[PDB]
Amino acid sequence: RVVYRPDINQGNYLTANDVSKIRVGMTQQQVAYALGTPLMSDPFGTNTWFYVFRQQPGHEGVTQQTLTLTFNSSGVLTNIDNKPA
Amino acid sequence: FNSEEDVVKMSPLPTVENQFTPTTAWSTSVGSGIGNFYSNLHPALADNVVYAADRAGLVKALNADDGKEIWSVSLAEKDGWFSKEPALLSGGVTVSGGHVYIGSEKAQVYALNTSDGTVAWQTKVAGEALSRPVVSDGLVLIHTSNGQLQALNEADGAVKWTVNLDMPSLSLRGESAPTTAFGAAVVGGDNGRVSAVLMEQGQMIWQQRISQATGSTEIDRLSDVDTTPVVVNGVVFALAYNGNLTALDLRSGQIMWKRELGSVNDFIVDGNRIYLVDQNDRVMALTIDGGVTLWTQSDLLHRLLTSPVLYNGNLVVGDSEGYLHWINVEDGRFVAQQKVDSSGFQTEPVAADGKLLIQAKDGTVYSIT
Amino acid sequence: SRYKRQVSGDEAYLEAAPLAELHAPAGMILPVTSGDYAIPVTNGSGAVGKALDIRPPAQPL
Amino acid sequence: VVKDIHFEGLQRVAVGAALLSMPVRTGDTVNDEDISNTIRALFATGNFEDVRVLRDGDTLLVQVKERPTIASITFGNKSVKDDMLKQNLEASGVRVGESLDRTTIADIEKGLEDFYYSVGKYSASVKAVVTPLPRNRVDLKLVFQEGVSAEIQQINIVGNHAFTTDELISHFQLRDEVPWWNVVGDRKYQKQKLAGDLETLRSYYLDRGYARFNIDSTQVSLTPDKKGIYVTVNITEGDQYKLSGVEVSGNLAGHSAEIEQLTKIEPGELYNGTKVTKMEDDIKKLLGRYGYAYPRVQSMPEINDADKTVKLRVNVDAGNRFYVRKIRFEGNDTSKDAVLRREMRQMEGAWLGSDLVDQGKERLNRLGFFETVDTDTQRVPGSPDQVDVVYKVKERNTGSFNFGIGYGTESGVSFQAGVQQDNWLGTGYAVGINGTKNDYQTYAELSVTNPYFTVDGVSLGGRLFYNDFQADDADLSDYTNKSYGTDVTLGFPINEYNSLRAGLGYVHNSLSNMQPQVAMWRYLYSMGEHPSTSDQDNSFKTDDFTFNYGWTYNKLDRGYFPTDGSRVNLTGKVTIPGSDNEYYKVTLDTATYVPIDDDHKWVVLGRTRWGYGDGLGGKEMPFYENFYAGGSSTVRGFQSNTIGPKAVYFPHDLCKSDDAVGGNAMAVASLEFITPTPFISDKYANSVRTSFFWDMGTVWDTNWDSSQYSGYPDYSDPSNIRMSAGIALQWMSPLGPLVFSYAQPFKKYDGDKAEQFQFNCGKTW
Amino acid sequence: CDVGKSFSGKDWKVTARAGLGYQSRMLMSVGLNAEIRDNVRFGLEFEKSAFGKYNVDNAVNANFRYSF
Amino acid sequence: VPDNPPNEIYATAQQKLQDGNWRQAITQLEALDNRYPFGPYSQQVQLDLIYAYYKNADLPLAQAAIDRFIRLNPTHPNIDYVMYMRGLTNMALDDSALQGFFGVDRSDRDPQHARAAFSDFSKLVRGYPNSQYTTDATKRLVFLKDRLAKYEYSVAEYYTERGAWVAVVNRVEGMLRDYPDTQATRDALPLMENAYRQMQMNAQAEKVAKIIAAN
């Protein structure tokens, strides 16, 4: 039930090979340098960055290539996951 | 609205007095015109024959005595239907050999044939040829609006060389005439200097920055100096392009006596006397040797004047409302005043072999006695 | 010239809801803060609004 | 040897601030060095310059001259906002209640003089005058006696062989001649505008293939009275040129197929400039789409004059991401925030789209509430990726008040009021009232509308009104009418081209003082009553619950002097059951533009309108809702509404008339062929436009009993069409956009009329 | 239809203007308007209309545009 | 005004001030200034002038005058008074338009005055915590903080109804990081939970709910 919905889109643009440009065992520095700065971090303790790619041109679908990844207590990568849904 | 005028006005009319009987002879007209546009197109004279011009259209040929024409040529061109593109002549006609020359405002220098009125040739030039085309030994050099002092040859209609000059950003409509000397030419510029070039090759050797120019550069500036220099005894009396009058040498061209008692339009010399126009009607006089002021009348103040010319004991001057303000050679009274036309005087008169002439705004030619 | 209300003063800013602080349940921790922040109590008796006399100090001598 | 200090009445400065650099320091023996030091100190501070210091005993006076201060301003100016001069004088170093020394006289003098020079008034004289008021004070007397205008005279050009000067100027801003009857541009001198003129001319050349074209100089002469300026330009027209492929090259993060496809071209074809501009901008647009923020497009040519052909290079690069973190606002002091957000096209927490923010700013300005809107893109500290735009706005007052009073010969005492409020409580809403009454009309209404009933654009509007026409031109149509009612509506865009709006409503009408004529009598007979048809003291009431629905469109290339696009329209109603006059109607309009030429100066124009309205339960649609046709709007030549059938007045046998009555079946079409002005000079030949035309029209009843009234021009004939033809001008006057029109209807029917002349104003529909 | 040329004043505003329009019946008129520094712009007016058959000769008019 | 012996016009202005009618006291004192810009009164003149300005509901003049008084003698045995007047000036300037007798909400016009007033009153209460102007300033600070937080609440709610379900969580996060004592946070947390839940990141909304249940 659409009438006229101008564009919608959220932070942290993403391509494909970029996320391949990281892997387990990397600190915050190189990963930031890879994929810019995260626009959604959890300020509730555990240092974790939330890269969410959600765009919606209107009338059709909400693609949200969700990506999470947690760091060491010192900031080194420990685990990641992609999620297109 | 008719309530948007704020300016220092002029004196209405000078002291009517008719010691002499100022008189006209005949008045022919050669079609509009000159209009409002400032220009330099003054009509010329040759051996009982004169030739006029206009701003947009044609030329003509007349008799010195009867105001009856001889022939008429136009220089327009049909364009589409009923348009007839304008020709835009704006360079005072002159005379040499069996021809004329016209400076048009579109880089064209026509050169017509005396008798019939045919085109001997027509040579494109640089800039916007404006100033008075002068002849000098087959080299009819002219000035322009880009400093480019070209030098054209008559028979061919071809360039001989080109000596560049300078220019400020903003400029008065400065159109210095050239001058001949022994094969060396001295011409005013548009910066505040005067140079001296030798004719045969187009290479100047000597220069001097005599004065200044107008525009956010305030020295004596509001002076419509026809910067035409004149020379006597080599010592050139090249007055000031803008007011700091000075006398200079033939070879060196160094200051003889800089007396900033000028802000000029044009002038003449007669042996000792020199007559000026101080951009503010302040007609005066002085001796050749140096700074003096035999007299000065200025009641004409702020009337739009034209450059004067000697006439058998009197100086004749034109106002912006068609009046001839006849003046004693020395002081300084007004020997005669005579209203002739209501169109408007903006160009210069000329005198030769008694025959005296002047142009109006539109109904150009009058035959002042 | 549309504001004379908050000029002569009124007891409007008075009786604003005082400030309490949250408290973190187990596990997570409320974020650290900084910046725009009430000064400590530093109690006095400077009255409120009209009960105080906004007057120019005397000479000053 | 001197220890005491001297300061003869500083009277404005601190005493220690004067003892800072005094060589009379305690325990410091003084010498000629003391004289030098005190002179240098009194001069370095520059506050005052009087001093008399020597080697004289134990005392040592260091005098002071106090010309400051000043608090006053005297003018002076004649046609310039004085406060602007106050600002500029602040920018020079002076202001009320402050020290002032005569070293500033020439400074401010020539500052304002060059100001006037820039404005074009190249003659002025500012006089600095001060008058000592007690012991410190003076006045600031400035008189302004200046020139007048120094207007333009001519703008000639040298070397323009390809074209002529006239059409070249056209295009320009600083027009030559201001005609007394086609004022479209007015002439002055704006040194800055000369640059824009130069650039637009150079572009004009570069959009034909003259690659190697370049200006080479410029003169601005001046006549020796500062009344007429001259201006000249030199050129080198070079030649035309061709292309050979396009050679994009750079780092594009891929991202090439769509690029190349976005750049294909027909070889050996004339170089275009503006096409290159559009193409490079479109590259920028695609990059903005993919996410990067600040792209670059540079195109240097690579010319083969021998081949008359240039291989155009293109070197581009993307840049970075540049996310936006928090879009703030500054200025909206009385306009609620939630307004200034919904007018945006850049959602916080995303990638920055430059064009998006600019389209925003544009929208915002277009909202009408504000007066001055400027942007910024400051960067957050620390992070290299995040920024946060801000919007500087300064709103102005919005609502308005009206009041008028009058009286006439054929009109009673006029009254007029209404509180037009645009931005009520800065809450998006809009409200207004009205009112007028002499004798015959008593118009009044009420207005309520919310342009945002939803967060998307779905509007909503209300309306109430009162209408009491009271005409008494005893016997033409003059059916006295009182009527009022109200309605609501919706409205919501779908494609920034189309639109819909489907309103409800309600209306109650009161007929009164009907006259004898059959059509209305027919309607009534089908309404149930039975008026004695020989006396005209009549009246009738009614109530109906209406329904509206429509659809609009626009595709015009421009908004002024259209040349290509369309404009269709539609509107229908239906009386919901429970009403008392079951009818329905449909209108339809259409404008159509087709440029038969590629230079867009020869265009055809096709207009058409349509209509239909019919009752439902054998009840003719009430005659106070009937169509019309004829007039300088849709059917030229005739008078207004002259087309159509005529009334039939009962006898108090039958007869006819010529006063129009209208009906319920409209149809009209027209055709035009735009054509330039074959006479006037092209100095301004773009601001006049005309065509030829050959129009149509028709109107007829649907329920006329064509049988009995055979002694009358039948009206169930749906074919009676009346055609006309002629020409018509269009050009802005010093008064308003005018459309002269002088046609002559060749055909007609009886009772109709002809109006040879047609003078209108601004048919900008 | 009819508006006047550029006219105003320093702390005031003089205006001279005539009147017609494309529009109610025909609207033939002429008048003026005056402005105070901040808000109000208003003046006087004479008019001439066309009521149906005949034409309305006279109409005077007050005005008060009080922006706010 | 006529020029007259200065102390006399000072007394007259003082009395007229005490009466209450400002305009004439304003003008008389301003003329006393402009006629003796270095009399022994000038300081007291500055005091009374800013006072009358503030009371005359004509702010910007008084603001510039405060600036001047500061820049002349930044140190002074009474400057705290100037500070208080600064803060009151700003706070007054917050609520502006024609809603005075309307009694309508005032939350979220442009707030870039409350922030000033906050900085300034804080500067005061830190500087000279002994003057008799403290506690009122504290109360004003509290009200100012709350009126600030309501702003972010408004914008966050708007986004929630719009759809930018990242910006909402980010801004309410910053808020929770800056004014973590008002009522506004305790009324905005549900928005943050709803936002998290909207973007399938329930692993956060659960903890948000833990918070909101703990209070």
From Swiss-Prot, chain B:
SMART domains: PQQ. It comes from the Bacteria. The keyword Signal applies. GO terms for biological process: Gram-negative-bacterium-type cell outer membrane assembly; protein insertion into membrane. Keywords: Cell outer membrane, Lipoprotein, Membrane, Palmitate, Signal. The keyword NADP does not apply. It is found in: Cell outer membrane. GO terms for molecular function: identical protein binding. It is a lipid-anchor. Belongs to the BamB family. Part of the outer membrane protein assembly complex (Bam), which is involved in assembly and insertion of beta-barrel proteins into the outer membrane. Nonessential member of the complex, which may orient the flexible periplasmic domain of BamA for interaction with other Bam components, chaperones and nascent outer membrane proteins. Efficient substrate folding and insertion into the outer membrane requires all 5 subunits. Part of the Bam complex, which is composed of the outer membrane protein BamA, and four lipoproteins BamB, BamC, BamD and BamE. Monomer. Interacts directly with BamA. The Bam complex has the shape of a hat, with the BamA beta-barrel crown in the outer membrane and the periplasmic brim formed by the BamA POTRA domains and the 4 lipoproteins. This is Outer membrane protein assembly factor BamB. It comes from Escherichia coli (strain K12). The gene is bamB.
Swiss-Prot record, chain E:
This is Autotransporter protein EspP translocator. The lineage of its organism: Bacteria, Pseudomonadati, Pseudomonadota, Gammaproteobacteria, Enterobacterales. It is a multi-pass membrane protein. It is found in: Cell outer membrane. The gene is espP. The chain holds residues 1208 to 1300 of 1300 of the full protein. It comes from the Bacteria.
